[PDB]
Amino acid sequence: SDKLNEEAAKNIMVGNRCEVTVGAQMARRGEVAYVGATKFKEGVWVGVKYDEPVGKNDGSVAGVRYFDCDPKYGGFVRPVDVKVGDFPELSIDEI
Template sequence: AHKRYSTGLTITEFKVLLVVGSPASCMDLELYGAEEELLGRLDCDEALLGSYAVADGCRVHVIDQSGTRMGEYEIAKSDYKKRPLQVEKYEITKSDYKKRPGDTSVPWRATSPLPRDASGPKGMSPFHGTRHWAQEAALAVALPLGAHCQVQLLGQPSKLATIMFVGQTHFKLGYWVGVCYDEPLGKHNSSVGSRHYFECQPKYGAFEDGIEDEL
């Protein structure tokens, strides 16, 4: 089946829905037709997707301009997994990661243990427990929006996702991380009650607190 997007989306909103491991702010988009002809660049973030020559069978070519992981990705409408093409994967061992000076969450976690078995105020998850809100805020800052991360919840296999929201919510105390999973393993589309927190497809969104370091 083809992947369809609303032509009423702005290019910025469209970028957020493309889970390719690159932050939306660092994407350059090229539109190709069904015959693989270049139709143009989607270069106006405020423009509507429908203002370009989009049609059934088109595909979008995503170029990562983040500078830290340069590469190109193919997004075919029929490809839900959005597999990267000819991109060298950056890998680092845990021992080398821990040696990096000051730019990871490892030093903070080493000096600020986070008890998962403490019981906190009513409405707060066990993970938040007795942590001070200042500590929660510090942990939240260490998780940049748009980063690809690994979600590890107790008793569940790890899942890959993109960080879409970090902060306080109206439905639970503490700081929470809103994610868009790579696969439909979530709970909703980021809407809780009447509040909509970020853009994602149904069953791809969730608010979690077991976020590992970004990939």
């Protein structure tokens, strides 16, 4: 319903790397797997495939599959909580 979510969504594209910050939560990075309307709630939703199992779903909500990923690796959030861009996975193999 927000204009803000409408704005923030303008440039969000499936395939984009991103960083999700919902509320108090610690920033989490992943890849945009879905952008747009869904069946569970009105407005725009961004489905994200997380780098770690820090999500709430496996790409499906209420039995409707929106995208694919392993359990706990997917999440749906409002566009205003998503920053898209060069957000590489936070990992250090050796330093």
